[PDB]
Amino acid sequence: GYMFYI
Amino acid sequence: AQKPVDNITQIIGGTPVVKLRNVVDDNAADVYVKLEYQNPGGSVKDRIALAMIEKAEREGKIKPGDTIVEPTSGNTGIGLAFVCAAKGYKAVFTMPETMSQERRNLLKAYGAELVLTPGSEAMKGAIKKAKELKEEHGYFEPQQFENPANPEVHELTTGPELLQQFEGKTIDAFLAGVGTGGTLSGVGKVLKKEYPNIEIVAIEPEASPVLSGGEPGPHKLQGLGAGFIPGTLNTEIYDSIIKVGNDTAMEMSRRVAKEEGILAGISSGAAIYAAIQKAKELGKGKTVVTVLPSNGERYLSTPLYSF
Numbered sequence: 001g002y003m004f005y006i
Numbered sequence: 007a008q009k010p011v012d013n014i015t016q017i018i019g020g021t022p023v024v025k026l027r028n029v030v031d032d033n034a035a036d037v038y039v040k041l042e043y044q045n046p047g048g049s050v051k052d053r054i055a056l057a058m059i060e061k062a063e064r065e066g067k068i069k070p071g072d073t074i075v076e077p078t079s080g081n082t083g084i085g086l087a088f089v090c091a092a093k094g095y096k097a098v099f100t101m102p103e104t105m106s107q108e109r110r111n112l113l114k115a116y117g118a119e120l121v122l123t124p125g126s127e128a129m130k131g132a133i134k135k136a137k138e139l140k141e142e143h144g145y146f147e148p149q150q151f152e153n154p155a156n157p158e159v160h161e162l163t164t165g166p167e168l169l170q171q172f173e174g175k176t177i178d179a180f181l182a183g184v185g186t187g188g189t190l191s192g193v194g195k196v197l198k199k200e201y202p203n204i205e206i207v208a209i210e211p212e213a214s215p216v217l218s219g220g221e222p223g224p225h226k227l228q229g230l231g232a233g234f235i236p237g238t239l240n241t242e243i244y245d246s247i248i249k250v251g252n253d254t255a256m257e258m259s260r261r262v263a264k265e266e267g268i269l270a271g272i273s274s275g276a277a278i279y280a281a282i283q284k285a286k287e288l289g290k291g292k293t294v295v296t297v298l299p300s301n302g303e304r305y306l307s308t309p310l311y312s313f
Contacts, residue, residue: 003102003128005080005228006150006185 015092018045018052019163023171023295028265029258029278035178035285035292039278040168043270043301050164050299051085054188057159058148059089068146070094075145077132079105080185080229081300082150087116098145100132106307129233150186151236160192168193168295169200178292179284181207181248183230183273184217187239189297194243205245209280212249217241226252228308229273229299248283250276256310258282259302263311269302272310 011017021044026037042050062068073096076086083099090097099113103122110120121139123131140147150156168177180197182190187208194206210217213225214233222233227250235241252272259275262268270278281296288294302311 001126001128002130002222002233003079003224004185004230004232006078006082006230006232 013092014046015056015089018047018056020167021045023168024266024268026262026266026278029261030282030285033286033290034282035288035290035294037278037281037285038293038295039268039274039281040164040171040295040297041268042164042297042299047085047088048301048304049081049085050189050297051081052088053159053163054150054156054186055082055085055089055148057155058150058153059086059093059095061153061155062146062148068095072096073098073143073145074148075100075136075139076148076150077101077129077136078150079129079132081304083113083118086148087113087118090118091116098139100135100139102128102132108307150188151232151238153238156186156188156238157192157195157240160189161196162192164189164297165193165196168197172293172295175293177201177204177295178288179205179207179281179294181209181277181281181284181294181296183209183227183277183297183299184236184239185229185232185273185299187236189299191238191240191243193297195240198243205284206243207280207284208244208247209276210247210249211276212251215247215249218247218249226309227255227273227276228271228305230276248280250279254279259310263302268298270298271300271302271305272308274298274300274302275310
């Protein structure tokens with residue numbers, strides 16, 4: 001469920 | 007003003023540097039910020055989108071008209087969408103279905119195709135789908151967290167720009183937020199060669215402090231905090247790490263917009279907060295440099311600029 005915006 | 011160019015990608019790079027005046031005082035070192043949002047597609051990721059596409063073309067891995075795929079909900083998707091439109095490639099992005107309609111409009115305005123993955127699966131679901139599409143269809147996958155063209159472009163462009171911009175000065179510290187780590191690694195390599203006594207500092211979220219040896223955790227520093235150590239990050243390049251909290255970064259971005267007239271994203275606020283901490287430690291007359299990856303206008307629907 002881990003989110004990042006790269 | 008630059009002479010006319012044949013393709014918008016030829017204006018990627020050459021970004022300006024501004025000295026901060028009000029958010030840091032005369033008792034601290036001077037702090038300078040490089041405005042990567044001045045790239046024509048709006049962020050530092052223009053550089054790596056161009057470099058990864060151009061390297062794959064130079065190696066015959068792709069040719070104009072080919073389709074590429076990348077899992078991305080951030081500025082790399084915008085950068086690749088932009089560069090693909092400018093260079094005649096087709097872009098496919100995988101991303102969780104939580105993406106906003108405005109962001110979908112932006113990527114589709116450049117002609118990109120979106121493949122939406124389950125929201126509850128977040129980035130893991132998007133990464134898995136991109137790999138599946140690559141294997142099923144033969145799409146080229148830039149792989150921003152492993153592709154050496156990412157740190158290399160910063161070694162060839164961003165870093166040498168800084169050397170030219172700081173001729174007649176020495177840089178005492180260079181700090182950058184780590185997403186892929188390509189900026190810190192490529193710029194850091196160039197600056198350490200020219201200025202062997204420089205300190206290189208990685209910035210990461212306090213809430214997801216993986217470079218510091220901690221565990222991944224939810225955080226709000228858009229552009230940072232991948233939750234793993236990227237292959238594109240040279241973990242030997244930095245001398246120290248500064249962890250920044252979500253609220254501290256937002257408060258700094260707001261101050262910098264109001265007091266400097268520099269409207270940047272939350273990762274820029276984190277970078278400036280860390281640079282100011284370092285400037286206070288180095289003291290008057292020293293020179294601290296950081297990078298602002300993206301513009302605050304891209305984040306008007308986040309809490310960052312919601313008053």
